[PDB]
């Protein structure tokens, strides 16, 4: 079950089988050995290659939507990683998952988001866009991606519900880094309009130790 | 059930429920409606919006696995939209799904696939990759992606799984375009070495009408 370690923002307790699933599974890679440039780079296919923890994502997040009132009507995924997981939560619930993409690999009518103005040298904001109408009004979306970072990624679905008329359920991501504070910053971002988002994070980078190291 | 198109192509026979619910479920765009530039860009949102299409594809593919022998021991989907069908059935299965991306989306130690070169004007091939030791030796890998085109993403699969030491079990795709001879091509590469690559369409192309037809 979830803990709040800050104002809408809940972490998986690290008791649960999931929790420690994630612990033992999640694997990270230094700047020399990833496609990226940050300390650590959580490989989602440390998650994908494991049966049993894939499984667990599912189960867990499956059941907790199915005994959530309002149920979610709506699974937006955030591209590419997202995708890994939201078509298999969605397929059990029987509603529609909907893709937040780049523009240019996006089809039909679309709507793009806005982002903030990058901080000091800092990481060039994506526009993220959804088709007009694939969230209709008084939808309930759950926002979904391996990993709270920023939480820029998480903004930009955030916009774009909204300005579909929409409501987010929540942001969910299967890793989330505190130290960064996405959820703090997006819940006092533009005069506090996102202060009810709900943030759920499965599993803490803090808890994540050089036993989680895949370097070579 | 699959019915044989061409050798070592199957494609899902037209009286089946799956078959008829892409048919009826499946959008394309023009090239102004769309990201890219082909006279019909099929929409893989219009199959991960419709739960009963999504469901269909995972109950049928599951199943497929599930009373194969020997079964599949991995799953591998190409970068993104092999993403939104891989996990889904990998889930039920108990099986690893892997990850086939451009070196700079994938972390680890990769190896890269060897694309022929481009024909007249045409298509740049796209270098794909896997992490090493993601697929073991004497492994069994069904490969998939949302639509087989041309065979280039596939045939970097194939290349991928076999300088693994591992065997492909097939290559599977929702949309298939049997225009583009994409199995009669990888059958005749390099002197016959994928002759025997069983391929599995979903549906056929051919199949789409204008009242497939997304554009607005
Ligand atoms: N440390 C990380 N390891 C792997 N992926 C990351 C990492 N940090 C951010 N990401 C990716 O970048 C996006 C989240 O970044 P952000 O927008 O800063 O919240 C997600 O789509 C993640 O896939
Ligand atoms: N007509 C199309 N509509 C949507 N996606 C396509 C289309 N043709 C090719 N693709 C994409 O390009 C890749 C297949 O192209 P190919 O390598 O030529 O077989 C897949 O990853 C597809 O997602």
């Known amino acids: 079950s979830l803990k709040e370690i800050g104002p809408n923002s809940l972490l998986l307790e690290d008791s649960h089988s999931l929790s420690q699933?994630?612990?033992?599974?999640?694997?990270?890679?230094?700047?020399?050995?990833?496609?990226?440039?940050?300390?650590?780079?959580?490989?989602?296919?440390?998650?994908?290659?494991?049966?049993?923890?894939?499984?667990?994502?599912?189960?867990?997040?499956?059941?907790?939507?199915?005994?959530?009132?309002?149920?979610?009507?709506?699974?937006?995924?955030?591209?590419?990683?997202?995708?890994?997981?939201?078509?298999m939560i969605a397929v059990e619930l029987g509603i529609p998952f909907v893709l937040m993409r780049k523009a240019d690999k996006n089809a039909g009518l679309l709507i793009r988001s806005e982002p903030y103005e990058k901080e000091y040298k800092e990481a060039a904001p994506e526009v993220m866009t959804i088709r007009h109408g694939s969230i209709g009004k008084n939808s309930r979306v759950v926002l979904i991606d391996d990993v709270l970072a920023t939480?820029?990624?998480?903004?930009?679905?955030?916009?774009?519900?909204?300005?579909?008329?929409?409501?987010?359920?929540?942001?969910?991501?299967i890793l989330?880094?505190?130290?960064?504070?996405?959820?703090?910053?997006?819940?006092?971002?533009?005069?506090?309009?996102?202060?009810?988002?709900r943030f759920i994070g499965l599993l803490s980078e803090d808890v994540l130790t050089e036993a989680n190291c895949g370097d070579l």
Chains 1, 2 share one sequence.
């Not at 679905?157 to 942001?171: D, I, P, T």
């Not at 989330?176 to 988002?197: D, Q």
Request: without cysteine; charged residues 20%; aromatic residues 10%.
């Open 21 to 87: 699933l994630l612990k033992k599974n999640y694997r990270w890679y230094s700047p020399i050995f990833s496609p990226r440039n940050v300390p650590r780079f959580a490989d989602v296919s440390s998650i994908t290659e494991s049966p049993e923890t894939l499984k667990a994502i599912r189960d867990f997040l499956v059941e907790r939507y199915r005994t959530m009132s309002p149920a979610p009507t709506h699974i937006l995924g955030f591209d590419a990683r997202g995708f890994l997981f939201g078509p």
């Open 151 to 173: 939480g820029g990624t998480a903004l930009s679905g955030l916009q774009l519900v909204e300005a579909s008329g929409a409501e987010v359920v929540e942001m969910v991501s």
């Open 176 to 197: 989330t880094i505190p130290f960064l504070k996405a959820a703090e910053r997006i819940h006092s971002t533009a005069g506090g309009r996102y202060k009810n988002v």
